[PDB]
């Protein structure tokens, strides 16, 4: 529940990144960064500082899961929370996310009120 948590809003789409941003806003979150892909993100992540990957499932060069497995077979990034943002609540996504090691999932578009609740539980389970 850090209203400053560094959200790597990994998504290749700007307006969404913007309302996500504005809702985070009406809810009080204002610290949001944008990335456009997995190599970019992996490159970006090969850097560091990222705490929450609000990663859209899909991107070019390397997607959400390769991102996630490479993230996982690699010594250094093996345990980052990745909130897979998904357009819809689906099981295999939910499970593959689970077997390759993902942290949680959410469905857009949400009201300020909903985004509000999901964040709460991951925070909960990871101990945040």
């Amino acid at each position: 529940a850090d209203k400053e948590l560094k959200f790597l809003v990994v998504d290749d789409f700007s307006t969404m990144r913007r309302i996500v941003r504005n809702l985070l806003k009406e809810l009080g979150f204002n610290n949001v960064e944008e990335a456009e892909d997995g190599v970019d993100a992996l490159n970006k992540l090969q850097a560091g500082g990222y705490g929450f990957v609000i990663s859209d499932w899909n991107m070019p060069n390397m997607d959400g899961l390769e991102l996630l497995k490479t993230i996982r077979a690699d010594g250094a990034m093996s345990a980052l929370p990745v909130l897979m943002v998904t357009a819809e609540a689906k099981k295999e996504n939910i499970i593959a996310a689970a077997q390759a090691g993902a942290s949680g999932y959410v469905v857009k578009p949400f009201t300020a009120a909903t985004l509000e609740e999901k964040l709460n539980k991951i925070f909960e389970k990871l101990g945040m």
Binding site: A89, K91, A98, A102, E124, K125
Partner: protein, 67 residues
């Protein structure tokens, strides 16, 4: 039949986990105790995988597979 027993749930979690298990599978005999949720389990997911997703909100030992 394997019964899943989800022991030890939280306020609104009953409703919510009810809501989450509700995404992976379907729960019957939903005993919404003040804090518990038992329901019978279908077998539609490898034990090893149900384990894996509930594991997004809950843990491996909160999970028991009995008959």
């Amino acid at each position: 039949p394997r019964r899943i027993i989800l022991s030890r749930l939280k306020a609104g979690e009953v409703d919510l986990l009810e809501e989450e298990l509700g995404h992976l599978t379907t729960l019957t005999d939903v005993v919404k105790g003040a804090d518990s949720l038992s329901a019978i389990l279908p077998g539609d997911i490898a034990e090893d995988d149900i384990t894996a997703v509930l594991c997004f909100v809950i843990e491996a030992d909160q999970i028991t597979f009995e008959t």
